[PDB]
Amino acid sequence: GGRLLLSTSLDAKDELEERLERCMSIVTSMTAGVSEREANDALNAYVCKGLPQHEEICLGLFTLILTEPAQAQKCYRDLALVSRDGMNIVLNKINQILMEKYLKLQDTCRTQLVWLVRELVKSGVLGADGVCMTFMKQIAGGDVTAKNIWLAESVLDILTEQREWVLKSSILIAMAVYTYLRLIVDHHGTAQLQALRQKEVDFCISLLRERFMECLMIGRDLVRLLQNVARIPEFELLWKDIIHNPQALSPQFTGILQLLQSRTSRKFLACRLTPDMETKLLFMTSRVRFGQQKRYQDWFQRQYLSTPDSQSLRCDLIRYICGVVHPSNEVLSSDILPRWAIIGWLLTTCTSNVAASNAKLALFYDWLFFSPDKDSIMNIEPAILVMHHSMKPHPAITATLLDFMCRIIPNFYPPLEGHVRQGVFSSLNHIVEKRVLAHLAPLFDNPKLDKELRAMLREKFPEFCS
Amino acid sequence: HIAAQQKAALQHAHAHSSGYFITQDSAFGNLILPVLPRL
Amino acid sequence: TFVKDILIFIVLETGVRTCKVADKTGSINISVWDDVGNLIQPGDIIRLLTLYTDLQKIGEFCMVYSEVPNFS
């Protein structure tokens, strides 16, 4: 039984934990039975003998900080004094722990690791912004367990207290805004959650108002996050400014169109999946044979999608599948589980009308302002392929998506109806030109579809229904 | 049925979601749509 | 070292303590007990008619397998 990670009788011994425990032993042996100056003298002498030695001491002190709260302040002081690489090796192991081990990290160590990161930020350690981003990635969307909520609030408190430092990094501002705008949606239904949500709201609003042009690098998906929190009073006010006074946010911000015509970086789409979610989704989309997906979907569903609070996660997964996962031609031609089949599965797991509606919009988000010189066929193809392949086994899925596509055009934002119609038109034309679907008429005028739905399609897009 | 169906769907969205929604007379499961705020 | 020759497999089902596991060559029942039996979960990748014993979990989810043939 180690002190760093939780382990059951069933669990194999962790190599990273094993190594860190040996580093700690090396440190404690050179510091046992001596003063505090004699200890620092020996550590300094040893560290100077090379970088493998430097690594052992730095990681040993690091591990003491995580496992021994009574010694942590002293060990952090000693770490800062002996470090010869600007604490690069420590930040590396922190990121590795966060990316690979967080789910097994013991409670004491999680607490200590947040304390440590706060210290690194205060010290202005190089790469601390990257550690904060890696830490945020571990806050799971659609998860209101006590441990997850604790992390959301712990990270937020660091960012709030060290806001002046936060302001030094444009990308950290945008990542923090993206992350917390999304988390705000999950934080209701309890006193603790109400308190947390208000803190997140005030934090995001402040960055949005003080640094709007930095936040604007997010692009189109920022609008999606903002519409999802639109009924919160501070965001109603922000939306009024976005629509009526965009120059008040920034003289470089002309209005909402500018944001909607700029596609979102994969960096943002990926940050809202934890590492375990990415690993499992990437595996399903690269290694699982079509027709063999049931148990994998069951496993994923049980871990990530089996609560009412978890419904919000579906939209993050959909955007990720559509905007991040772009399988190679080899995979595309093989019998591997296609992206459309995963989307179809995710759609059917919606337990509420709200979650279903949000999921449909997320699926279509790149269609709305689609431009073939910018946006990729890969982003819009799952929606059309879900519709095509569902027609025979699940016609209701096809029908609901076709109805959504028609209704979203005048409604998404009425003053931009002409742009949205042009986006959907361009998406469909691109789908045909790229031979994703060589002909739309067999779909838009399929005999299995309700005739009134087909009349609406022919009214909207007569050029495609012949 | 059908205005009553729209009313109920919108009420459920308002109760549990901070998103902006409008109603539609959809016969295909789109009684509400998430859209941009209208002033 | 493969299932069909009857060791690494993935846990498909948990059944009182019977578990269906599988690799790329097919499935097989294995009898486990004690607290380990309460620890094993569907999706677990374990390093080890009915199979008998140690058991170590080396990961989860990301393993290709086949349900057939069911060698039990």
Per-residue buried b or exposed e for A154-184, using 16+ beta carbons within 10 Å of the residue's own CB: bbbebbeebeebbeebeebbbbbbbbbbbbb
The answer for residues whose C-beta is within 8 angstroms of residue A370's C-beta and 6 or more apart is: A380, A423, A424, A426, A427, A430
Note whether A touches C: 3 CB pairs or more under 8 A: yes
Structure tokens at A328: 């190679």
The structure's method of determination equals X-ray
Q: What's the number of domains chain B is made of?
A: 1
Q: Tell me if A9 and C35 make a contact (CB, 8 A cut-off).
A: yes
Name which of A185, A240, A412 is nearest B35 (Cβ-Cβ): A412
Extract the tokens encoding A325: 């996962």
How many other C-beta atoms are found inside a 10 Å radius of the C-beta of residue B26? 20
Find all residues with CB under 8 Å of A170, minimum gap 6, and list them.
A211, A214, A217
3-state class (DSSP) for residue C62: coil
Flag whether B28 is in a domain. yes
- At B23 the three-state DSSP class reads strand
**In this structure, is residue B24 part of a structural domain?**
yes
Task: Tell me which chain B residues have a C-beta less than 8 angstroms from the C-beta of A453.
Answer: 27-28
Q: Do C57 and A10 touch (CB under 8 A)?
A: yes
Q: Where are the domains of chain A?
A: 1-260, 274-466
Q: Rounded CA gap, A168 and A152, in Å?
A: 22
- Cα separation, A238 vs A232, whole angstroms: 10
Which chains reach chain A with 3 or more Cβ–Cβ distances below 8 angstroms?
Answer: B, C
Q: Which DSSP helix (H) or strand (E) runs through C18?
A: strand C18-23
Write out residues 131-170 of A within 8 Å (CB-CB) of C. Answer: none
Give the CA distances from residue A283 to residues A278, A323, C44, in Å, rounded to whole numbers and listed in that order.
8, 16, 15
How far apart are the two ends of chain B, measured CA to CA in Å? 28
Query: Resolution of the coordinates in A?
Result: 2.0
Residue C18 CB: number of other CB atoms within 10 A? 14
Residues of A in contact with B16 (CB under 8 A): 352, 354
CB-based contacts of A219, cutoff 8 Å, min separation 6: A259, A262, A263, A264, A265
Contact A337, A343 (CB under 8 A): no
How far is Cα A154 from Cα A162, in angstroms, rounded to an integer? 12
Beta bridge partners, C23, equal C26
Q: B32 to chain A, minimum CA–CA distance in Å?
A: 7
In chain A, the residue whose alpha carbon lies closest to the alpha carbon of B38 is A413
> Which subunits have 3 or more CB–CB pairs within 8 Å of chain C?
A
Q: B28 and chain A: CB distance < 8 Å anywhere?
A: yes
Closest in A8, A12, A283 to C61, CB measured: A283
Residue A88, CB-side half-sphere exposure with 13 Å CA sphere: 5
How many angstroms separate the CA atoms of A435 and A429, rounded?
A: 10
Cβ of A37: how many Cβ atoms within 10 Å? Answer: 8
Q: Looking at the domain assignment, is residue B39 inside a domain? A: no
- Residue A34 has a CB neighbour count (10 Å cut-off) of 12
Beta strands across the sheet bearing C8-14? C26-31, C18-23, C8-14, C44-47, C56-60
CA distance A162 to A122: 8
Residue B24 structural domain: 3-34
Residue among C19, C44, C61, C65 with most chain A CBs within 10 A, to mutate: C61
Chains touching chain B through at least 3 C-beta pairs below 8 angstroms are A
Which residues in chain A are closer than 8 Å to B13, comparing Cβ atoms? 353-354, 357
